[PDB]
Structure 1
Amino acid sequence: AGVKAYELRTKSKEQLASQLVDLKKELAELKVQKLSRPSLPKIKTVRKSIACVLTVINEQQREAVRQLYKGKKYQPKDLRAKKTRALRRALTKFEASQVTEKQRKKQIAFPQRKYAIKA
């Protein structure tokens, strides 16, 4: 008796916004019904429906923003990774794997060899 998520993935944004308007009107009616009602199960369903509608709308907006910012060598901070303090900072892998050219020539000239003793 409730909405599905995947059904809302197919819809256009105006269909989702009109569905939202419908659910808010349904909520406004169910409040008038619920001020007479001791227990109405339908309002608990429709608030979850409003939540899922907002989920699908926000998700489509965010993925549209990601697609328009896809090519650039930048991003809005909220769209970036969250990870923590200082995993933002202080190194990338490339900035840690980076080595001078002299030690590069040294490792080319004398790498750490593989040997087996007592043979």
Structure 2
Amino acid sequence: AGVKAYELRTKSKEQLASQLVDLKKELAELKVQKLSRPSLPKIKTVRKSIACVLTVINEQQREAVRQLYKGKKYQPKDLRAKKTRALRRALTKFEASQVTEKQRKKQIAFPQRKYAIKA
């Protein structure tokens, strides 16, 4: 069974930390029983619930950092985009669409026209 992330995202940070320490206590109490019993698969659900809780906590923290750095240049290098090194070093579509006043005037004066040949 385990915990569901959609009912954890409604919780606060402290509630989640208490949940996490309780789950770790349960995991220790289960590891002391695993050596007595022949088999104990209940431990898997507790492990995955710990993972879900930590994922939710990470998300909650990262979104707050995103909102702190919202709308300003120089945000951190784990909240930026990863796309690729070369695509990150590539010219933007602004810098690549820049032209001189000489070429702008010629593009405006003599653009490629739409012509057809029947008459």
**TM-score (structure 2 length as normaliser):** 0.96
User: Gaps spanning 5+ residues in structure 1: where?
Assistant: none
Quick one: distance in 2 between partners of 1:75 and 1:86? 19
Shift of 1:25: 0.3
Q: Counterpart of 2:85?
A: 85
Shift of 1:73: 1.4
Shift of 1:37: 2.1
Cα offsets for 1:12-37 (capped at 9, x unmatched): 00000000000000001000011112
- State how many pairs are aligned: 119
Shift of 1:118: 2.4
Cα offsets for 1:28-51 (capped at 9, x unmatched): 100001111222121000000000
Quick one: distance in 1 between partners of 2:97 and 2:38? 66
- Given the alignment of the two structures, is residue 52 of structure 1 paired with residue 52 of structure 2, yes or no? yes
Q: Percent of pairs identical after alignment? A: 100
Moved beyond 4 Å, runs of 4+: none
Q: Counterpart of 1:107?
A: 107
Shift of 1:71: 2.5
State the SS of the aligned residue for 1:11.
coil
Shift of 1:101: 1.1
State the SS of the aligned residue for 1:75.
coil
**TM-score (structure 1 length as normaliser):** 0.96
Q: For 1:14-25, what aligned pairs fall within 5 Å after superposition?
A: 14-25=14-25
State the SS of the aligned residue for 2:2.
coil
Quick one: distance in 1 between partners of 2:38 and 2:113? 80
Quick one: distance in 2 between partners of 1:114 and 1:88? 37
Quick one: distance in 1 between partners of 2:108 and 2:12? 59
